Amino acid sequence: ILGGREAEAHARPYMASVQLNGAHLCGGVLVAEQWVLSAAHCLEDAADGKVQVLLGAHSLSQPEPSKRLYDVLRAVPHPDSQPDTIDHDLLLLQLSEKATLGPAVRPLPWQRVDRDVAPGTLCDVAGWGIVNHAGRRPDSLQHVLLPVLDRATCNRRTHHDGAITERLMCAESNRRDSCKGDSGGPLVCGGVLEGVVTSGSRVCGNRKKPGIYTRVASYAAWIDSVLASA
Numbered sequence: 001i002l003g004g005r006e007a008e009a010h011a012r013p014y015m016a017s018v019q020l021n022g023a024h025l026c027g028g029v030l031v032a033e034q035w036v037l038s039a040a041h042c043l044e045d046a047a048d049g050k051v052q053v054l055l056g057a058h059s060l061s062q063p064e065p066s067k068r069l070y071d072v073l074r075a076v077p078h079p080d081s082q083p084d085t086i087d088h089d090l091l092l093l094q095l096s097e098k099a100t101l102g103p104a105v106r107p108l109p110w111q112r113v114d115r116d117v118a119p120g121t122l123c124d125v126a127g128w129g130i131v132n133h134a135g136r137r138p139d140s141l142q143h144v145l146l147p148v149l150d151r152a153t154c155n156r157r158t159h160h161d162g163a164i165t166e167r168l169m170c171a172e173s174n175r176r177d178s179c180k181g182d183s184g185g186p187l188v189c190g191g192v193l194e195g196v197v198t199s200g201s202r203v204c205g206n207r208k209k210p211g212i213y214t215r216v217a218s219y220a221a222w223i224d225s226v227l228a229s230a
């Protein structure tokens with residue numbers, strides 16, 4: 001997160017760190033007792049390592065009573081995702097067992113009605129992504145509030161030049177932004193999960209290159225089928 005501040009510890013009990021051999025790769029969001037939602041490109045580099053999900057965390061390194069690193073039984077990238085596109089950029093991770101819930105670990109309700117979040121709406125994004133252009137990794141969870149950017153502006157030649165389909169949404173990126181390592185994390189509006197940070201490479205913090213987030217409501221059939229597949 002660029003331009004953000006350190007989050008209140010455990011104030012976002014849905015927040016997940018998706019890891020490869022104990023290193024943070026991507027954000028994620030606990031959406032059911034046994035399932036974490038993230039972005040499909042997050043496991044690009046994962047084949048020879050172990051994917052895990054850290055729940056209950058504020059610091060990535062320090063001991064906290066609510067922190068628990070779960071193994072992943074199954075990783076289910078969206079079947080229409082492709083390397084080289086950011087369409088269908090969703091991933092569902094089935095934890096080894098149901099997560100232990102409490103005040104610091106709780107699923108986030110997610111948007112099931114397929115209608116646009118209205119523009120200018122202030123949404124929360126949190127993550128352990130990079131905090132400066134040099135690539136510095138924070139140890140603890142950061143967040144920022146970002147206004148939703150209307151799709152027509154996001155589609156202008158100056159911005160993303162018609163790449164923003166109905167299944168994606170944008171947020172402003174003027175200094176305050178999501179960035180590398182925030183990929184897969186949640187964009188929350190009115191206490192409901194609305195978007196998942198995409199996981200393609202991009203500039204961060206440049207107003208003409210808005211952040212792009214996959215609209216969960218657009219994928220409700222897919223999420224529901226996977227979630228039921230246990």
Ligand SMILES: NC(=O)c1nn(CC(=O)N2[C@@H]3C[C@@H]3C[C@H]2C(=O)Nc2cccc(Br)n2)c2ccccc12
Pocket residue numbers: 024025026041042043044128129130137138178179180181182183197198199200201202203204
């Ligand atoms: N939404 C964006 O702005 C964005 N998304 N990605 C993808 C990304 O982020 N990752 C891809 C999915 C894997 C793992 C992961 C990664 O490298 N993780 C990583 C690498 C170094 C430091 C930290 Br923290 N996380 C970017 C890459 C470059 C610049 C901006 C971004």
